[PDB]
Amino acid sequence: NQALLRILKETEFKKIKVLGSGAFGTVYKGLWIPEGEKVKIPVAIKELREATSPKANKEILDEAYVMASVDNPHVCRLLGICLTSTVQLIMQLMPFGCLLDYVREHKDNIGSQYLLNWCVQIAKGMNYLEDRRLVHRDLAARNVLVKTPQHVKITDFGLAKVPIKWMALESILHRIYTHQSDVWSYGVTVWELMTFGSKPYDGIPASEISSILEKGERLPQPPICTIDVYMIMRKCWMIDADSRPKFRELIIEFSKMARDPQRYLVIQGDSPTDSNFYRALMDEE
Amino acid sequence: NQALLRILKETEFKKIKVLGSGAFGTVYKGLWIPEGEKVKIPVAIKELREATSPKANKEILDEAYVMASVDNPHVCRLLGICLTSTVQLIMQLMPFGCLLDYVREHKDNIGSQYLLNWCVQIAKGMNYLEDRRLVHRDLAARNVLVKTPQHVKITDFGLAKPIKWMALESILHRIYTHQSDVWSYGVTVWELMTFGSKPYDGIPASEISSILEKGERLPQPPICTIDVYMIMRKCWMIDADSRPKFRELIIEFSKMARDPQRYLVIQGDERMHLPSPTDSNFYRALMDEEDM
Ligand SMILES: */C=C\C(=O)Nc1cc(Nc2nccc(-c3c[nH]c4ccccc34)n2)c(OC)cc1N(C)CCN(C)C
Numbered sequence: 017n018q019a020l021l022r023i024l025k026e027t028e029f030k031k032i033k034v035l036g037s038g039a040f041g042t043v044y045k046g047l048w049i050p051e052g053e054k055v056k057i058p059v060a061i062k063e064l065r066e067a068t069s070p071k072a073n074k075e076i077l078d079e080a081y082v083m084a085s086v087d088n089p090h091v092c093r094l095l096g097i098c099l100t101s102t103v104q105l106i107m108q109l110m111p112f113g114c115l116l117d118y119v120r121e122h123k124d125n126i127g128s129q130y131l132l133n134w135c136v137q138i139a140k141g142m143n144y145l146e147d148r149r150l151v152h153r154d155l156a157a158r159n160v161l162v163k164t165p166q167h168v169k170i171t172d173f174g175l176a177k178v179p180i181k182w183m184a185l186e187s188i189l190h191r192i193y194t195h196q197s198d199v200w201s202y203g204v205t206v207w208e209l210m211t212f213g214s215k216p217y218d219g220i221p222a223s224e225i226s227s228i229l230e231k232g233e234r235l236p237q238p239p240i241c242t243i244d245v246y247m248i249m250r251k252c253w254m255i256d257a258d259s260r261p262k263f264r265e266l267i268i269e270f271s272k273m274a275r276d277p278q279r280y281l282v283i284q285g286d287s288p289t290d291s292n293f294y295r296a297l298m299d300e301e
Numbered sequence: 302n303q304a305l306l307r308i309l310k311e312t313e314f315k316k317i318k319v320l321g322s323g324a325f326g327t328v329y330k331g332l333w334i335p336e337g338e339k340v341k342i343p344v345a346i347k348e349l350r351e352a353t354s355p356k357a358n359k360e361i362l363d364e365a366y367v368m369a370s371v372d373n374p375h376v377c378r379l380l381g382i383c384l385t386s387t388v389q390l391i392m393q394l395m396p397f398g399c400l401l402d403y404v405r406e407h408k409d410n411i412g413s414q415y416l417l418n419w420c421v422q423i424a425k426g427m428n429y430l431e432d433r434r435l436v437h438r439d440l441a442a443r444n445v446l447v448k449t450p451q452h453v454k455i456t457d458f459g460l461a462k463p464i465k466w467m468a469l470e471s472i473l474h475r476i477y478t479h480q481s482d483v484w485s486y487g488v489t490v491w492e493l494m495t496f497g498s499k500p501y502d503g504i505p506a507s508e509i510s511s512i513l514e515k516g517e518r519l520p521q522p523p524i525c526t527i528d529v530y531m532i533m534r535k536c537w538m539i540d541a542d543s544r545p546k547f548r549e550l551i552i553e554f555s556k557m558a559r560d561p562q563r564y565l566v567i568q569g570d571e572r573m574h575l576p577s578p579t580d581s582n583f584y585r586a587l588m589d590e591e592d593m
């Protein structure tokens with residue numbers, strides 16, 4: 017339990033290069049130097065934006081034990097924390113980056129097998145989070161990290177210290193966050209993957225998204241998506257939260273589609289060797 | 302089978318720094334650059350010193366498929382191969398280096414639990430090779446790599462195509478069996494417990510078979526109780542069938558590893574210790590996710 021979160025000193029790790037930023041702070045590639053050893057181990061470090069208070073630290077640290085306890089192949093685990101003026105969180109470095117940048121850079125030479133399997137894995141990770149009674153609140157393609165092209169993982173859930181175009185209507189109007197609002201964001205996340213990282217509702221300011229949603233408008237059908245896949249997305253954006261699919265169902269339906277991917281995605285152009293190769297070098301779990 | 306060995310292009314990996322040299326060539330720290338991606342993945346690359354023909358390459362490929370097939374937490378697997386004028390072999394990079402160098406450089410901070418656990422793991426890897434009917438032929442502390450200080454893996458077997466680590470029958474008649482590997486295992490354990498001392502330091506290699514036939518053996522390491530040295534001595538019996546099996550060495554060093562200060566007497570053993578579960582989880586999540 018308590019063996020899952022390592023407390024680090026300033027002196028045993030260094031930030032070397034900035035990787036990104038989130039609403040919580042900046043993400044760095046760092047190097048961990050085990051005390052008394054001579055190696056330097058790549059890590060990712062999340063520096064919280066504000067210098068935090070001892071009441072926040074006690075809430076942060078005890079919540080860090082929960083984040084350090086998530087045990088699922090498609091959810092990133094927190095590994096360590098360092099409490100300086102600003103709090104630093106240490107997790108595994110994913111050299112491929114987020115799925116959003118990955119799908120933009122491979123814009124039309126990703127096949128249906130990868131796209132559908134990513135949807136299965138994200139649904140698997142979210143369902144686990146639901147099983148642990150954890151609401152993500154910010155599911156998006158930028159918050160799915162690529163461990164290998166064949167293996168993606170959810171990150172950056174937790175902490176209560178806005179992404180309007182991913183949020184369920186009830187989150188926009190009332191700031192209600194449930195697993196069923198995570199389902200809405202999952203639907204948006206699936207659409208991002210199917211459009212290869214297009215910006216949702218391009219041309220509409222965030223301040224007007226709830227008006228168009230109340231009027232019944234939704235993200236359009238991606239060109240490569242059959243109506244089978246689109247109906248699942250549209251069901252994720254129902255106004256009634258309880259009519260939306262559950263993540264456990266999304267696992268099943270998308271697993272079914274992944275067995276005949278060319279039937280459910282019309283992508284123009286549709287080995288153990290390379291999977292075993294990737295697993296040996298990057299992905300032994 | 303043929304799916305465990307990736308055939309690489311020259312243009313998808315780069316040698317960046319020389320790590321050391323061996324009998325079959327030079328080993329580099331390198332970078333693997335997957336086609337069409339932007340990432341650079343650290344690897345180890347071994348370039349063969351001598352330049353081989355296409356028919357030599359076919360036999361090399363036949364063994365590279367065997368080397369790519371080893372699936373064990375304590376044996377290094379060949380991952381890929383590139384067929385240049387000199388053949389390049391690609392495997393996982395072990396940032397901690399080889400155990401011989403590690404034990405020399407960290408000798409004043411290595412406690413009994415580490416030494417005994419290394420012995421267990423090397424025997425496990427050798428027992429796997431024996432189960433695969435693969436004779437190592439060159440087991441030594443230099444050919445055991447440190448993935449982490451808690452996890453070592455045997456390397457650089459599968460060569461065929463080091464007098465002071467060899468069984469007598471290997472020196473005299475070039476007989477290599479799993480039981481001659483056991484003798485080399487005994488010498489490797491002696492290397493660890495002496496923190497990387499050179500065996501028979503100052504004795505010319507050509508005269509080693511003489512002293513072995515006359516019954517001389519490596520001395521009891523200062524930190525070893527007689528229990529540990531008796532095992533080493535049983536590894537160096539002239540009758541190969543009388544030496545212990547790797548299966549038995551897993552068991553005996555495991556028993557000792559459950560009470561490590563009873564079997565190794567190290568000055569300072571109490572102020573050193575293995576990592577807490579916290580430090581083990583942290584290590585594995587960052588560097589070592591395999592089963593073990
Ligand atoms: C889409 C943004 C992105 O993630 N980019 C990115 C990511 C990583 N690796 C990584 N590893 C562990 C955690 C995280 C992480 C967690 N939360 C966030 C929030 C924002 C960004 C990253 C986050 N990321 C990279 O590793 C090298 C690189 C990378 N990029 C694309 C950096 C920019 N290039 C041009 C150098």
Ligand SMILES: */C=C\C(=O)Nc1cc(Nc2nccc(-c3c[nH]c4ccccc34)n2)c(OC)cc1N(C)CCN(C)C
Pocket residue numbers: 320321322323328330345392393394395396397398399400401402443444446456457
């Ligand atoms: C004792 C020699 C040694 O292995 N040194 C070493 C090794 C690695 N990593 C590594 N990874 C995969 C394969 C090999 C390997 C296989 N055969 C050989 C033969 C010679 C050298 C290496 C070989 N090695 C290192 O990773 C950074 C470093 C390293 N060194 C140079 C340790 C010396 N320093 C710590 C002073």
